[PDB]
């Protein structure tokens, strides 16, 4: 019993801003994380090998990760 009123400033607006910021970050953070995991699990990284004779590669074929090549 005998509870008092604790006077504090309105935390509704700051909490609303934090909720909006986390939601708008996550809204594209979840798809990009899912995309990176699907790239690394299935497609995967490249394998280093010597240059075949008479064959010149593209410039984007000089890199390892699929996203870097893209």
């Amino acid at each position: 019993g005998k509870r008092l009123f604790i006077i504090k400033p309105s935390g509704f607006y700051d909490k609303r801003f934090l909720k909006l910021l986390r939601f708008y970050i996550l809204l594209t953070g979840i798809p990009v994380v899912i995309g990176i995991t699907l790239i690394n699990v299935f497609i995967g990284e490249a394998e280093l090998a010597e240059i075949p004779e008479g064959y010149v590669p593209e410039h984007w074929e000089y890199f390892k990760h699929p996203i870097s090549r893209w």
Partner: peptide, 15 residues
């Protein structure tokens, strides 16, 4: 969700 996250993904995967 357009400049910050995708920019961090771009810089993280610079060739």
């Amino acid at each position: 969700s357009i400049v910050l996250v995708l920019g961090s993904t771009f810089v993280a995967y610079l060739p």
